[PDB]
């Protein structure tokens, strides 16, 4: 792919309801 | 050393006027001091999304190489009035397009100087040197025929041609809308 541009990088309180940690609780 | 045609400037003003409230971007194609023979717009408002940018660039490359052109510039008009510096999106896109040809340099439509007649060159050209992007001399001549660009932009805006202008996003909405927008091209030819 000749246009595989990456736009990630810097990610900058947290928005309400958000929880970054991937929890396996089930 | 970046040179663009008057039709490129009028397309710049057309796309800026089309979505005055939304930041826009797009590319500039040239044939292989590069002269940007033509331009093409793409999207507006939200600009940080990758999939649209990738699909765009692929289509731009296909269309240009089919008709002997190659993409050689990137344009971006920011949304904020007091904003004239490139964002991450502009920097990465300019770096990626410049990866092919070193003559490729970024341009940004400084919306602060955006007026009816475009009295002063709104576009600012940034070059990539020393792994950094920095603007060229603002006092440099940008358009090939500055009075012609001024008059054609004023006529097109006063003729309500900005509403008629179609960018890549409208093509995404419906292919029936011509993304090559030759209508503004014939209007430019008639005006000139």
């Amino acid at each position: 792919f000749k246009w595989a541009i990456e736009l990630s990088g810097p990610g900058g309180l947290y928005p309400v309801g958000y929880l970054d940690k991937q929890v396996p609780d089930t | 050393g970046v040179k663009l045609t008057t039709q490129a400037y009028c397309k710049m003003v057309l796309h800026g006027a089309k979505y005055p409230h939304c930041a826009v971007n797009g590319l500039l194609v040239a044939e292989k001091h590069t002269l940007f023979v033509d331009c093409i717009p793409l999207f507006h408002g939200t600009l940080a999304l990758a999939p649209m940018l990738e699909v765009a660039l692929t289509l731009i490359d296909s269309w240009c190489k089919d008709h002997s052109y190659v993409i050689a510039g990137y344009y971006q008009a920011n949304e904020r009035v007091k904003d004239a510096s490139p964002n991450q999106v502009a920097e990465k896109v300019a770096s990626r397009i410049a990866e092919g040809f070193s003559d490729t340099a970024l341009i940004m439509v400084d919306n602060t100087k955006f007026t009816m007649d475009c009295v002063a060159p709104t576009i600012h050209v940034y070059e990539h040197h020393e792994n950094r992007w920095r603007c060229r001399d603002p006092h440099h001549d940008y358009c090939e025929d500055w009075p012609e660009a001024q008059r054609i932009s004023a006529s097109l805006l006063d003729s309500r041609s900005y509403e008629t202008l179609v960018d890549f996003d409208n093509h995404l909405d419906d292919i029936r809308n011509d993304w090559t927008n030759p209508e503004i091209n014939k209007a430019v030819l008639h005006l000139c």
Binding site: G11 | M52, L59, D178
Partner: protein, 281 residues
């Protein structure tokens, strides 16, 4: 061309949040100048839009007229108060607008318009981080506001926090399962966010958007390209490789069909053919 026709057009143009300030301000001016008395209070909401368009259009001359009429009609009204705040913001007058919004809040604490306008002021001032913080705090008392939710997602995308943007789009889809736009946008955000662990989500949500709307050819070739990237990715398993290759082939077939329809609909040069020449590559 009767005032009812432009009235219906303005009603529609208000129902869907358009921003063609020129057209809407012209139609509203024609209605309030020629057919002001032809209909009753239904122009009053128009008197709102007409000024907002004006503030968008820059033609501030009739903004004062609309504001004075509304104020003289509705004294001590929070809606007109927010509208005056926007009038102040039209000329970057931020301190007075903030003071007015604070007065509205102290007069009525449950009002959400003041918070939205003040964070709009903050984001107009360029303080993106504080705007994000203000939206997060405001949502903490008003969880479920879709407009603020989408605005925060857009701000995060602009600021490139695709994780938070993806989370906000997930909860927005929670609010509106049936909106294919949210699914397409979330697929795009996830694809931009990372790799296969997100490419799978992007392609699944692109397929969902296509299911929700077959005409969303944007999301169509988005799914196509996501499948293509998954195929090109070495980390794809053999079964995953063939699955995503099948997805890409099906999407390509749909793309050729869509561009053939684009061809039969119009009459011009075969740009659609060039397009599928790109896809075949």
């Amino acid at each position: 061309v009767t005032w009812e026709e432009m009235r219906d057009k303005m009603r529609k143009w208000r129902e869907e949040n358009s921003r063609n300030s020129e057209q809407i301000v012209e139609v509203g001016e024609e209605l309030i100048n020629e057919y002001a008395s032809k209909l009753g209070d239904d122009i009053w909401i128009i008197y709102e839009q007409v000024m907002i368009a004006a503030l968008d259009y820059g033609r501030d001359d009739l903004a004062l007229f609309c504001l004075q009429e509304l104020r003289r009609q509705f004294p001590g009204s929070h809606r007109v108060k927010r509208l005056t705040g926007m009038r102040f913001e039209a000329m970057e007058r931020y301190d007075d607008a903030i003071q007015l919004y604070d007065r509205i809040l102290q007069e009525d604490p449950t009002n959400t318009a003041a918070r939205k306008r003040k964070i709009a002021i903050r984001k107009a001032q360029g303080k993106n981080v504080e705007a994000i913080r203000e939206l997060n705090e405001y949502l903490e008392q008003f969880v479920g506001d879709q407009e603020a939710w989408h605005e925060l997602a857009e701000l995060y995308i602009n600021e490139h926090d695709y994780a938070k943007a993806a989370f906000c789009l997930e909860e927005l889809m929670m609010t509106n399962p049936h909106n294919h736009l949210y699914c397409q946008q979330y697929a795009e955000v996830k694809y931009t966010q990372g790799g296969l662990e997100n490419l799978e989500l992007s392609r699944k949500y692109f397929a969902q958007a296509l299911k929700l709307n077959n005409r969303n050819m944007r999301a169509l070739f988005g799914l196509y390209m996501s499948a293509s990237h998954i195929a090109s990715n070495p980390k794809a398993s053999a079964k995953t490789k063939k699955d995503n290759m099948k997805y890409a082939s099906w999407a390509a077939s749909q793309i050729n069909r869509a561009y053939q329809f684009a061809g039969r609909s119009k009459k011009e040069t075969k740009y659609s053919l060039k397009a599928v020449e790109d896809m075949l590559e």
